[PDB]
Amino acid sequence: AXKXX
Amino acid sequence: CSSSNNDAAGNGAAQTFGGYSVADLQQRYNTVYFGFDKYDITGEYVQILDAHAAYLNATPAAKVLVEGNTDERGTPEYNIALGQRRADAVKGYLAGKGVDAGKLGTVSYGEEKPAVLGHDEAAYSKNRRAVLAY
């Protein structure tokens, strides 16, 4: 997904 | 030309590293603002890098401690990593200027100890920053 944010 | 401005005629020796003085570089200009998962610095905050560099180099035993702190969103491992790297960016910057690694320092408290409570572009933007700690 990654780092979100 | 240089020496275009005069304080009191005394001399230019006045403490002014790259534009500012220690008392300012340590309490006024020493914080950079990053963006969402951003790994780059902005020209607006570059001046500090060159100013701190002049002061850091001027002092042999002077070491700069870069403190990184991004949005809590995610996890220390995810943050600390993202930050520690950005920190590596600035640390290597001064390094390229001639500053010894032994005088450089980096860290990151991502989710560890958040700054601005909340999760909105306002609070989040205020959190995306690495404060040059001496």
Per residue, what are the HEC states of B15-54?
A: CCECCECHHHHCCCCCEEECCCCCCCCCHHHHHHHHHHHH
What is the sign of the dihedral through the CA atoms of B48, B42, B34 and B64?
Answer: negative
Question: In terms of Cα–Cα distance, which of A5, B126, A1, B76 is closest to B37?
Answer: A5
Give the Cα separation of B120 and B133 in Å (integer). 26
Please give the tally of structural domains in chain B.
Answer: 1
Taking a contact as any Cβ pair under 8 Å apart, which residues of chain A between 1 and 5 contact chain B? 2-5
Q: Virtual CA dihedral for B88, B89, B90, B93, nearest 10 degrees?
A: 110
The CATH number of whichever domain residue B75 belongs to comes to 3.30.1330.60
Judge whether B45 lies within some domain.
yes
Q: Are B72 and B110 in contact (CB under 8 A)?
A: yes
* CA B4 centroid distance within chain: 29
Residue B124: CB atoms within 10 A of its CB come to 18
Is position B83 within any domain? Answer: yes
Burial B56-79 (b: 16+ CB within 10 A, else e): bbeeeeeebebbbbbbbbbeeebb
**Residue B47: domain span:** 26-134
Q: Which helix (H) or strand (E) holds B108?
A: strand B104-108
Please check whether residue B69 lies inside any domain of the structure: yes
- What CA–CA distance (Å, rounded) separates B106 from B62? 14
Position B13 in a domain: no
Cβ–Cβ contacts within 10 Å for residue B90, how many? 22
B36 and A5 in contact by Cβ < 8 A? yes
Is residue B52, in this structure, part of any structural domain at all? yes
Q: How many CA atoms lie within 13 A of B41 on its CB side?
A: 23
Q: In what order do the strands lie in the sheet with B64-69?
A: B31-33, B129-133, B64-69, B104-108
| B101 occurs within a structural domain | yes
Chain A residues with CB under 8 Å of B78 CB are 3
Which strand (E) or helix (H) includes residue B91? helix B76-96
Give chain B positions within 8 Å (CB) of A1. none
From residue B65, how far is each of B35, B90, B105, B120 by CA, in Å?
A: 21, 10, 4, 28
CA distance B104 to chain A (A): 27
Q: Which amino acid is at B38?
A: K
Across the interface, whether the CB atoms of A5 and B82 are under 8 A apart is answered no
How far is residue B63's CA from residue B104's CA, in Å, rounded to a whole number? Answer: 5
Cα–Cα distance, B112 to B53 (Å, whole number): 29
**Structural domain contains residue B3:** no
Q: How far is A1 from chain B (nearest CA, A)?
A: 10
Closest approach of chain A CAs to the CA of B31, in angstroms?
Answer: 22
A:B CB pairs within 8 Å:
15
- The answer to whether position B4 is within a domain reads no
